[PDB]
Amino acid sequence: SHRKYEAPRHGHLGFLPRKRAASIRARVKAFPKDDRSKPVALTSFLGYKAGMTTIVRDLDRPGSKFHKREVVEAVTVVDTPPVVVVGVVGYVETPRGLRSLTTVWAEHLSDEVKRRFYKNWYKSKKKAFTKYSAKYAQDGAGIERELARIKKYASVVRVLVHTQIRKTPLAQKKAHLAEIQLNGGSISEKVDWAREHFEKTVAVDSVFEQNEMIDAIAVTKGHGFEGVTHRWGTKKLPRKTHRGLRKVACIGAWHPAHVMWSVARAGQRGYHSRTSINHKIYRVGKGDDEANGATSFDRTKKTITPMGGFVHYGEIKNDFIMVKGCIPGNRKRIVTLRKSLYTNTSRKALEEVSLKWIDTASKFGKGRFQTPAEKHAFMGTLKKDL
Amino acid sequence: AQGTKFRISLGLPVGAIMNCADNSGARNLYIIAVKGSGSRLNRLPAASLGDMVMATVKKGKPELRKKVMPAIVVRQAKSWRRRDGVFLYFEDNAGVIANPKGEMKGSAITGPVGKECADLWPRVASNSGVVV
Amino acid sequence: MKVEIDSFSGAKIYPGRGTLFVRGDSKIFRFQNSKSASLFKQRKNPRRIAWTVLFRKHHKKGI
RNA sequence: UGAACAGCCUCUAGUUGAUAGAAUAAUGUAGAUAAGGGAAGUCGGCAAAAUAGAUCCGUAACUUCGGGAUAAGGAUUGGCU
RNA sequence: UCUUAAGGUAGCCAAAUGCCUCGUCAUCUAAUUAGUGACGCGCAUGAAUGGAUUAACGAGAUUCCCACUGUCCCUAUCUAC
RNA sequence: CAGUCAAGCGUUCAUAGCGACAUUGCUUUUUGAUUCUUCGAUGUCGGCUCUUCCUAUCAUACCGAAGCAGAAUUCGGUAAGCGUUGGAUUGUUCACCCACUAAUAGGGAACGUGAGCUGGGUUUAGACCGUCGUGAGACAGGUUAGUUUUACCCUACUGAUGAAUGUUACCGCAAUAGUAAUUGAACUUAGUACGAGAGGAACAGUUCAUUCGGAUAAUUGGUUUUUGCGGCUGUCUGAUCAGGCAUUGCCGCGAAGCUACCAUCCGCUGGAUUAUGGCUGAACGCCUCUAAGUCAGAAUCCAUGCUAGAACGCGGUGAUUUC
Fold first, then answer.
1. Strand A97-105 and strand A83-94: pairing?
2. DSSP labels for A197-238?
3. Which chain A residue has its CA at the smallest distance from C35's CA?
4. Which helix (H) or strand (E) holds A285?
5. A72 and chain B: CB distance < 8 Å anywhere?
6. What residues bear Phosphoserine in this entry (chain C)?
7. Do B86 and C28 touch (CB under 8 A)?
8. Which of A69, A139, A309, C57 is deepest in the core (most CB within 10 A)?
9. Nearest 5°: phi and psi at A273?
10. Closest chain C residue by Cα to residue B111
């Protein structure tokens, strides 16, 4: 028989199966379209999510209720230390798809990145990339043939990069490895830029800038086995029901004699790699100078880090990026940022942002004071300080 | 509505008896019908800080009853957040009598009125006290 | 984004939080934590509560 | 303590007898809480919640004058001298 | 006048008794096959095969009102096993 | 429910909209006719919750016709991608009423769904009323209460390990399989087009908003076993401090975590097409969107994007056991 009261379906039909990702770092499946007219530059970056604070910006959009007026919003800060290039990958084009032709690496490999290839670093003999370094002894001819091969074949060229993790508060000591793709210029120019940046670090200012559209890729936070009620959002059974109320009352009909795949079923929720589109960069900060949390309007001498540092992460000392809205994944989770694929001109992307106030209060509860000077001024003399 | 009022936060659903604050003789308003919403299975339509909502009286004038008649709500009980960022909630949920267009049946309202209501239908803001 | 003063104990209102509760005559009170608003809810009469900046000037503590 | 052999703690006396440990997922059994609405869900106020003791004023329709009645509905409840 | 006994007197009702019926009128509601009070040529009410009001009462069934509350809007969290 | 003919309605006038007298068919969402399957047993009504499918399309998208001047309204075509409510009474499936919105379209899946639930009715035993019957008893007549058992095994689904291809680790490609966003209001257009006036637009730009989905808890609420602090009551430790029990003794606040359209951010554009409107051009020396080719074009289809990755799809790279 037909449904008595038609209702919209529960859950998305494009995010199945809701299962754990193959790796902690979510992989990227798409890159911006290559235009061989612009100077070569990175189209992605790596960063560990630190936390979110409160900032005050200016609402500048014709037709809105208030113009040139203040507003509050949430903004997520991600700690992104400068990345170090260790190699490039040449991808040839085949009828069955892209294929990895060859890989070239650096002469000197850091301990952090080298630890990624080992599961037991203390018991290992540290015999990684030993005989490979001998290829550069006489004149480096062991890779110049490979360099020429990458120049000729492999129409798509991508640079292999790693992060420096000894500069972050996380006590992990293992560099995360990802893939960065070069946009702009010819293949020879891209490979020349890649080889000229060997064993070198690049700042986040050269890859991202204020007032742009930035997308984020990351895996989410898991929650274990969970019934349908919160996994999907189905209506719970009434109180008078027997054998419990937190499940799907009906999972299908007699014909076909199977349970429909589209039927919501109890399983795992969270820890899924997810894609967030249209995040707006508000300000990019530098770790080598003070006044990270100080704007032109509010010239109070303070840093981005809140009172007592960020919860569960620590303090910020390297380059940090703050972006509007929430980012998939919890704190200290690796997030690899990706530039916008399509040129979103419209109107929601051409505005100019001007930060006014930065909240640095104690996020470890209901803190009020921003800087120790303000707390001392409003608090007066204490008993602990003699 | 000569203006697009912001995201709706509920708190005054169908079946709520709410008092009156204007000079039409009406005392309490019984929420029975709300427009501006949509269709959802087993979802009770609700109200917000100023919506075009019809209602009926349960106590008061003998002639102001026994018919469906429009009304306007000026105060809510659930916390409301303006985009500048402030959690506002009035003490008692009150409203003002109105015709379908927005005309007055009484003379003046009693107590404060939300600024969003002022940015809404202007005739209630005309015969208002303080606006906040 | 100018800072206000708390209407219960006396504090510094930064944008993001606050409760009003009004009165009906539009006194417009502003609070800063759930503790202060809840303390005002049962009419605790902040002429008697101790750890108050209002008390810091009334009871002559920390002058 | 308490009007009370109500409920709770202790004295004499008796017992420590119910296979145990580490994890704290869903769904469950049992106990509670949830801002605003206040029965709009449901055949149906089903379940839970709400007032609950003592003292003072007052307590309607009907009536067989015995009852309704703790009607409904208002104020107080600590400690020390 | 008739087979005979006379054709329902006092009372009551769409009542637990009414197929037509969701009968008609008034009230309760924004809205009522629900409730109450009436209208009675009542298929098929009715006086000890007993009718009504009944004062008080019922782990009997139904309707309405106040406070109330996760029954619901709209689900979330804690505990022991 | 859909076609054919045409005496006529439509002031004149057959298909703008209808069409009697008749005829040819369509599916089994009504009810019928048989009992072929089941009476050493398919749990039988309705409601709640949930998935999918059909078009005989209510609205949205794109178009055509009208006695279509605007608006509004009627009919038809491509169309299942999306939506199709909340409530008074009744067990209701039906039916009626109130209000909303774009509208609250029609149906199936053993008259979908009881080892998912509810038990009001039907449909045991008790009992009452009215009719029939001397009677026990009957009433597709009415009312009240009346136990709804079990999953561990197989398949399927949600997820999760996993030996084997020389081992191990990293970076990976991408066949397959799923897909997602829908809709409306307001300012300007514009009191403009149109219309005499009453009336009264549409396309761009902007503000947004209904439902749904994906994430996160800075802000606010909730949660209290942080038993963290403070306060309170009964009892016990000679008294104070500090304390035990009263199945978490009670109350206020309450950090962290979790969560809340009760909080926040986000939900992309390129191609090819259906309906339809067009070009050249004969058949048919003219005409013709069609026969060849070709243009524009839908919420349609496929790609851009996202999710999982053949555990017997594949590539590159480091070191590969002196004993």
1. antiparallel
2. TTTEEE-GGGT--SS-EEEEEEE-----EE-HHHHT-PPPPP
3. A366
4. strand A273-285
5. yes
6. 7
7. no
8. A309
9. -65, 130
10. C24
